[PDB]
């Protein structure tokens, strides 16, 4: 997702009091609204409970190296929460896929949709379920009756763009409390007046 020619606040996206986890590096969480960037990229996907640990700048594994590589200069925020009551069902929910095998490393912020059968040896298989080859794509094991470490969690990534360009998005002055019956200075669109 790309957000351009819009303006919004991140305070609503934090006071939900329902997110199980929250990770944002590069910028302090309480001082990101007033700082202004150009574009915001939203990368939304699903992942298990034992793989949210590997989604961090500078970690290895089987998902953070084969599906989405996090660079060292990663300044985005990761917001994840549990919604197992909608994306899982009895009898086996196998609608979600993930990659297990890859030939080599992949560049960060790059998507791979190759369905070619990964070759482990030197003998071709001609795309069959034979010997010395296996399919890289494997189905998940989601179940609504799981514990706390294997449920489908929704993981999103909100990165920022920093280039020689204007800010499509910005943090405008918030709605300050409308204090009353006190000598307070205000500026309501035409004048900087002080009074009750």
């Amino acid at each position, epitope marked *: 997702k790309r957000i351009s020619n819009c303006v919004a606040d991140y305070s609503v996206l934090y*006071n939900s009091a329902s997110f*199980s986890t*929250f990770k944002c590096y590069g910028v302090s969480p*309480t001082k990101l609204n007033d700082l202004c960037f150009t574009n915001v990229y939203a990368d939304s996907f699903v992942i298990r409970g034992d793989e*949210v*640990r590997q989604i*961090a700048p500078g970690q290895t594994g089987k998902i953070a190296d084969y599906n989405y590589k996090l660079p060292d200069d990663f300044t985005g925020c990761v917001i994840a929460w549990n919604s197992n009551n909608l994306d899982s069902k009895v009898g086996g929910n196998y609608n979600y896929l993930y990659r297990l095998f890859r030939k080599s490393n992949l560049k960060p912020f790059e998507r791979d949709i190759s369905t070619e059968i990964y070759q482990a040896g030197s003998t071709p298989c001609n795309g069959v379920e034979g010997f010395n080859c296996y399919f890289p794509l494997q189905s998940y094991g989601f179940q609504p009756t799981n514990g*706390v470490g294997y449920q489908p969690y929704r993981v999103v990534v909100l990165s920022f763009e920093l280039l020689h360009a204007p800010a499509t998005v910005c943090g405008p002055k918030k709605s*300050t*409390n409308l204090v009353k019956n006190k000598c307070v200075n205000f500026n309501f669109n035409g004048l900087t007046g002080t009074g009750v």
Partner: antibody
Amino acid sequence: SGGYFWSWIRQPPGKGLEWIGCIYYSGSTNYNPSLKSRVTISVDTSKDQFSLKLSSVTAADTAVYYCARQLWLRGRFDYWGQGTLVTVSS
Amino acid sequence: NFMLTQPHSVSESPGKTVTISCTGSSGSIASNYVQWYQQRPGSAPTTVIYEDNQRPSGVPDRFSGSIDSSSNSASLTISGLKTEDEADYYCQSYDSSNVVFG
């Protein structure tokens, strides 16, 4: 104003800090599971203060109560008030 | 049922380097932000680190924190121990709408 939270944190003498509950300037409230159904905290913006009410206080409730300002709901308590001493005796 | 495990007693001579751990039982230690608080006896606790690696303005540089997420343990490294460093250290978490201390 400012969109920050308030929280009450107690600490028994010689023991670690214990989180009681947190409040917003609206009616949003969350309480500790061990202290659930006993913490009643309200905010009166007219007097610019908030109060906490506790029910069924026992002799094990002797702790130093700290009113700390909380900037980030998942983050630090940047400003801590001085701890009043609470003693329960019969 | 998530609780932070901390060493009850840690001692070190001044001028050396000591490491204070904070291990989470159920939830992973990189899941939520970890705050370390240094509290003097008979005084209010004060925040000495935030965001698990960032030092607030006022504290010395020596209050360095590191995260070992594989072992589910939060680490706080102290270098150059002094007299005023003798205080209670508590690590903080959030879990899920329930703040848990160390």
